[PDB]
């Protein structure tokens, strides 16, 4: 329908809180109309253990997607 | 089909930037400014007062208030009250828009001036300023103007006083300043 306005967050480090407790930081690579996001070089902030080279996050469990860069 | 309610122009159905283009132009940027000026102007101009419930005064309450005196009512003509209302509204607007910035002029030569008062190189709201004035750069050092008093600055502006009470001022100053 309407693609979310994330064309300015491309290839910039962001930190988004999975569900209500987890917080994942990575480099955004793409997104879908459901607000699914694929972010590379993830790191589960808590010491903090990396996730993998390429992860996808279902847009249902995303709450906020604040960006840790110039934007 | 969605139209702007300020411009009143009927816009072919859009949802993307087409609505971010219309709302970011000038016929929808200042024509939405004139609208809310008028609506806020009204709520300033409103003079309707609360409903008045008048109770029948009793004898004990009437006799004392009738004893004292009658009080004269001051009244103006139509043109005079027109002029007075215009003056009062203008004075209210002028005072409401007034902002005091003496502290900004006082610290004009501070060692860390360009990083705080310039308001474009600040760290909190500088991210907004960072197609469209001799701006003060952040790279200024205190070596520039080692001695501020070398005729560079000017005297502090004298304090303002109310004009309607301008005859209240003392006639002569204590000392003779040239």
């Amino acid at each position: 329908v309407s693609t979310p306005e994330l064309k300015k967050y491309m290839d910039k480090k962001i930190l988004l809180n999975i569900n209500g407790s987890r917080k994942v930081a990575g480099i955004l690579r793409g997104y879908d109309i459901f607000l699914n996001v694929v972010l590379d070089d993830a790191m589960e902030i808590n010491n903090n253990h990396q996730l993998g080279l390429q992860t996808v996050i279902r847009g249902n469990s995303i709450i906020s997607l604040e960006a840790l860069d110039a934007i | 089909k969605f139209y702007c309610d300020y411009c009143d122009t009927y816009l072919t159905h859009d949802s993307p930037s087409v609505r971010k283009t219309h709302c970011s132009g000038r016929k929808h940027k200042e024509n939405v400014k004139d609208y809310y000026r008028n609506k806020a102007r009204d709520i300033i101009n409103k003079h309707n007062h609360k409903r008045r419930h008048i109770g029948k005064r009793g004898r004990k309450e009437r006799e004392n208030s009738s004893q004292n005196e009658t009080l004269k009512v001051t009244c103006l003509s139509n043109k005079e009250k027109r002029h007075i209302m215009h003056v009062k509204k203008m004075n209210q607007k002028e005072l409401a828009q007034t902002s005091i910035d003496t502290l900004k002029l006082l610290y004009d030569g501070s060692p860390g001036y360009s990083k705080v008062f310039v308001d474009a190189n600040r760290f909190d709201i500088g991210d907004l300023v960072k197609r469209a004035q001799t701006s003060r750069s952040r790279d200024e050092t205190c070596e520039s103007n080692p001695f501020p008093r070398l005729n560079n600055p000017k005297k502090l502006e004298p304090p303002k006083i109310l004009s309607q009470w301008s005859n209240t001022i003392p006639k002569t100053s204590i000392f003779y300043s040239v």
């Binding site: - | 009080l71 501020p148 209240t168």
Partner: protein, 136 residues
């Protein structure tokens, strides 16, 4: 830091915060009354606020915001509970209050103008520069 000569900005912040948050509107009077007596650099702005805010009063009972009922009845000879015709009486109360404010303004203007004429007009530097600086 309230009694600073250049303390207009702090009092402006305090007044805007009170006017934005408080809803009873008695603290505004209780703070502007104190501001009226401090010899600030910009006492004129606060006196104009006081004059306009006293000029927009609309009924006898709101004069109790200013001072106490006994004080109004005894010093200014103004009766808040005066029932009858209240238009001219409220105008009389406004005139008396404006005269009192004019006398307050006379005192404060004398103080501020004396200070500025004698001392504050000669001072050019108000900031700490460096240990290597020389002051005149």
């Amino acid at each position: 830091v309230g009694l600073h000569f250049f303390s207009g900005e702090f009092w402006d912040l305090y007044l805007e915060q009170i006017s934005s948050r408080c809803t009873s509107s008695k603290k505004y009077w209780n703070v502007l009354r104190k501001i009226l007596e401090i010899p600030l650099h910009s006492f004129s702005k606060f006196y104009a606020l006081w004059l306009q805010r006293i000029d927009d009063i609309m009924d006898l009972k709101q004069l109790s915001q200013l001072t106490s009922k006994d004080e109004l009845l005894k010093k200014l000879k103004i009766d808040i509970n005066y029932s009858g015709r209240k238009g001219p009486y409220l105008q009389d109360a406004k005139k008396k209050l404006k005269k009192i404010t004019k006398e307050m303004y006379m005192v404060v203007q004398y103080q501020v103008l004396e200070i500025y004429s004698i001392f504050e007009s000669k001072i050019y530097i108000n900031y700490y520069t460096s240990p290597e600086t020389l002051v005149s």
